[PDB]
């Protein structure tokens, strides 16, 4: 419906690129060419070192970490024919999980999610994924991941992956990720439970900062996870041509556990909006014996230094010969009515 | 005809008319001497600053032809951004804003652009506009905007108004810049006041910049006759900018969404606060109200009447009493 | 690995013209944007012009509009600088930088210039 | 065009001490600002970008902070080779001017 030309930025030359984000500390390609019985793997950083893979018969892994070297990403796109608006998609960090389709190869934008215990946060960083009939190519933001389990599957032959042909490899990385969001989910399980017994114990702001923001990273976490059911359930059932019938079951295994995965989502929220409330019922608590307090003492005081005044008055025909002594009479009221009135505060249990 | 905007001061029609090699430009407020400008094969701009002076839009109305109910659109300042296309002009409606850094206030302006043959006609409420770059342009012939017709003067006026919107968004990336570490750091009425002004601010720029999109988009996807089909590129190009405004808004409405959500979480404790102050006060000082009230009584043959200087014996037992409850508040771990 | 070279600057007569060559190695001069900056004898550093070398987007600077020239070759991946008319106080040094963009908002971008040239000395005298 | 006016001029401070450089933009610039770093008769080293972020390879003693329109850089802890001239520079347009400069000196 649309041509898909480039953004056509402001302040921005038309031609350029920009890769979107904040790291810039690594470059690094890393090459693994497996095949029946033999393979390779091996790190580099020249671009030219990694082109001659693309007419490789033999299924291949290309992973370039660091995408903010514009140029080899520029320069893979244009060897391998990939439209300049999908290098801007691999380019720009702020979006969200995304599978597109084209006749020479299939595009898929994902997120890998770490929480440190720590710092109580969620970072994010986007991974772009280019399977061509072929090649598996894979940008990443920064140093680490989470398919170091591929890469033992692959240099220990364990498994099938290396019986099939790159779209297995694609869905041991797309499984990889799916299988760690579960590491994630866990240790967001284990910081709600010991923040929780904190605002139990300990009802203070700070407890509710962490409790805000957690909020955001479980609505940053939904608005994530949502697309990737999308991906997968197109994955699956738009069936490309690229990806073979066989390892279409596979796909569907996983679909499920993204499922899982948004159903234990379903799940936190509710219990953080719970423990927020709990909050307010410890703090409210403390609040409602400070005024108990405000009352046991006024409700003895205010209408009883009445009395005093009703004495205070600057009268003449008062009646004052009372009996015996007119102020233990007073105190005798006072006396009485103090009593009346904290036991009536007792049997309130207050 | 209504008008509804509050500026009813300013008059003035300026004029102006290009060709390849030619141009003419001056500033009247009679009408009559203006109207035949669109008789010319020469694309020209009519600009009119006076929509509160509705009897001179309502006769180039009449003598431009277009339907009564633009001329109401027009009119009604109080309106979201839309488009319009008929077989003889194109009716669009904008917003520019200016943003004041001293007082914090975004205060908008309506425009009104209306594309007919050859020719294109303005309507501004006040004196003050953004497009002075696509009159240097047509001056100076600094771009190709003499060489183009109307419709590219239509797209160099969006432009112009595109650009502006980033200017005001730098202002405004600025003040969150600085609101954002004040309320982090130092949070005061007046932090909490800025965030509302910034978040409503933000909410009309939202609410401006989406139907703006929309209008855009109306304009290059779809192909009137009006506007040529070499001008298409352009105009998506500025909604691409468009798209780009939008993206900062959301942003900075998230940010300061985030600023408030922060802000009010520590209601619960600033009520603990006046609780334990006040409870103090009054447990503190009702019971020695009260024992001066015992002692202040008029009474006769009262038994301490004379008994080793009573009132230094009274204010000691009554100071003894603060003491201990003062001593019971400092132990429950209040104050 | 990456290096930029400048070369050209010398001695020229005022009203003179001369062309200053940046060569660069171990990168491609089409994907980055380079810039000609500029620091007198004892002054600080004034910016003079920008290319881009894939779409040839220029941009110079307000002092040396219409006098200056910026231009870029991808075939022997050099940037050139035909600097026209000369006057004495273009007498400086000259930097070759090479500059990429960063993201801020979603409306504003910036560049920064991490690799520079020795720098060629350019006297406009006598 | 944009003006960015550094101040100090000539600070001299001895090694081992913080040291701040404020510079303030005539205009709003969206945090588009940079900091270079020129020891007498070489080329400058960029050290901050986007007026907050470090560069790779650069000590994280320097830093680089935002308030409205004013950008400081500080360096916690002075060392010998820390002594040159700072300069300040505004990406915000396609005119990107520097400042003045900022010699450091030996107290």
């Known amino acids: 419906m649309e041509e898909k030309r480039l953004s056509a930025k402001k302040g921005l030359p038309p031609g350029t690129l920009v890769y979107t984000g904040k790291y810039r500390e690594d470059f690094e390609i890393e090459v693994m060419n497996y095949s029946i019985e033999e393979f390779r793997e091996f790190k580099t950083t020249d671009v030219e070192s990694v082109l001659p893979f693309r007419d490789s018969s033999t299924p291949t892994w290309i992973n370039i970490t660091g995408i903010h070297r514009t140029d080899v990403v520029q320069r893979v796109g244009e060897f391998f024919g990939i439209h300049p608006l999908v290098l801007e998609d691999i380019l720009n960090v702020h979006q969200r999980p995304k599978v597109e389709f084209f006749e020479n190869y299939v595009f898929i934008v994902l997120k890998m999610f770490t929480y440190d215990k720590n710092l109580h946060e969620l970072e994010s960083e986007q991974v772009s994924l280019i399977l061509t009939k072929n090649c598996v190519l894979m940008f990443q933001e920064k140093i680490g991941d989470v398919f170091d389990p591929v890469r033992e599957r692959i240099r220990y032959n364990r498994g099938i992956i290396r019986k099939k042909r790159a779209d297995y490899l694609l869905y041991s990385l797309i499984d990889a990720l799916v299988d760690d969001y579960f590491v994630l989910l866990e240790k967001i399980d284990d910081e709600i439970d010991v923040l929780e017994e904190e605002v139990l114990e300990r009802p203070e702001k700070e407890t509710v900062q962490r409790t805000h923001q957690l909020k955001r990273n479980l609505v940053e976490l939904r608005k994530t996870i949502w697309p990737l059911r999308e991906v997968l359930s197109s994955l699956y059932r738009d069936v490309p041509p690229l990806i073979e019938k066989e390892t279409v079951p596979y796909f569907r295994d996983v679909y499920d556990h993204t499922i899982q995965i948004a159903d234990t989502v379903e799940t936190f929220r509710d219990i953080v909006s719970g423990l927020l409330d709990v909050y307010l019922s410890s703090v409210s608590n403390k609040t409602n014996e400070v005024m108990k307090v405000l009352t046991i003492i006024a409700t003895i005081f205010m209408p009883l230094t009445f009395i005093a005044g009703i004495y205070g008055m600057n009268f003449e025909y008062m009646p004052e010969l009372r009996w015996k002594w007119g102020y233990p009479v007073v105190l005798a009221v006072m006396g009485v009515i103090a009593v009346i009135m904290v036991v009536y505060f007792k049997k309130k249990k207050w | 005809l209504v008008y509804t905007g509050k500026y009813r001061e300013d008059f003035e029609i300026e004029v102006m008319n290009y060709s390849i090699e030619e141009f003419r430009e001056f500033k009247t407020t009679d009408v009559e001497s203006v109207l035949p400008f669109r008789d010319s094969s020469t694309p020209t701009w009519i600009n009119i600053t006076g929509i509160h002076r509705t009897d001179v839009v309502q006769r180039v109305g009449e003598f431009f032809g277009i339907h009564p109910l633009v001329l109401e659109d027009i009119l009604n300042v109080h309106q979201r951004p839309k488009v319009e296309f008929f077989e003889n002009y194109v009716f669009i409606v904008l917003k520019m804003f200016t943003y004041d850094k001293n007082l914090h206030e975004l205060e908008s302006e309506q425009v009104s652009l209306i594309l007919t043959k050859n020719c294109v006609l303005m309507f501004q409420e006040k004196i003050g506009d953004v497009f002075d770059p696509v009159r240097e342009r047509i001056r100076y012939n600094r771009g190709i905007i003499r060489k183009k017709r109307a419709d590219y003067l239509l797209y160099s006026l969006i432009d112009a108004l595109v650009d502006d919107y980033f200017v005001l968004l730098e202002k405004i990336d600025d003040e969150i810049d600085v609101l954002e570490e004040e309320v982090l750091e130092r949070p005061e009425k007046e932090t909490v006041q800025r965030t509302h002004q910034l978040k409503r601010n933000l909410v009309e720029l939202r609410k401006t910049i989406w139907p703006l999109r929309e209008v855009l988009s109306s304009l290059y996807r779809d192909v009137p006759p009006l506007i040529e089909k070499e001008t298409v590129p352009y105009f998506r190009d500025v909604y691409d900018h468009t798209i780009q405004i939008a993206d900062t808004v959301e942003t900075f409405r998230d940010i300061v969404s985030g600023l408030l959500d922060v802000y009010l979480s520590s209601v619960s404790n600033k009520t603990n606060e006046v609780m334990k102050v006040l409870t103090i006060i009054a447990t503190i000082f009702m019971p020695l109200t009260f024992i001066a009230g015992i002692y202040g009584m008029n009474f006769e043959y009262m038994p301490e009447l004379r008994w080793k200087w009573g009132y230094p014996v009274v204010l000691a037992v009554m100071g003894v009493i603060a003491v201990i409850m003062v001593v019971y508040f400092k132990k429950k771990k209040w104050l | 690995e990456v290096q930029l070279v400048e070369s050209g600057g010398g001695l020229v007569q005022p009203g003179g013209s001369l062309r200053l060559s940046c060569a660069a190695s171990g990168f491609n001069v089409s994907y980055y944007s380079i810039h000609w900056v500029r620091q007198a004898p004892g002054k600080g550093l004034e910016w003079v012009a920008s290319?881009?070398?894939?779409?040839?987007?220029?941009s110079y600077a307000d002092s040396v509009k219409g006098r200056f020239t910026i231009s870029a070759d991808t075939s022997k991946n050099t940037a050139y600088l035909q600097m026209n008319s000369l006057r004495a106080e273009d007498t400086a040094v000259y930097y070759c930088?090479?500059?990429?963009?960063?993201?801020?908002?979603?409306?504003?971008?910036?560049?920064?210039?991490?690799?520079w040239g020795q720098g060629t000395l350019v006297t406009v005298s006598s | 065009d944009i003006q960015m006016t550094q101040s100090p001029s000539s600070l001299s401070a001895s090694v081992g001490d913080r040291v701040t450089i404020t510079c303030r933009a005539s205009?709003?610039?969206?945090?588009?600002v940079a900091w270079y770093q020129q020891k007498p008769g070489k080329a400058p080293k960029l050290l901050i970008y986007?007026?907050?972020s470090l560069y790779s390879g650069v000590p994280s003693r320097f830093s680089g902070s935002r308030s409205g329109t004013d950008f400081t850089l500080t360096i916690s802890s002075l060392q010998p080779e820390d002594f040159a001239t700072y300069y300040c520079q505004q990406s915000s347009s396609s005119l990107i001017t520097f400042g003045q400069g900022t010699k450091v000196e030996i107290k």
């Open positions: 986007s007026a907050s």
């Open positions: 290319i881009s070398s894939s779409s040839g987007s220029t």
């Open positions: 930088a090479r500059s990429y963009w960063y993201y801020i908002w979603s409306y504003s971008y910036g560049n920064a210039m991490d690799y």
């Open positions: 205009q709003s610039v969206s945090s588009a």
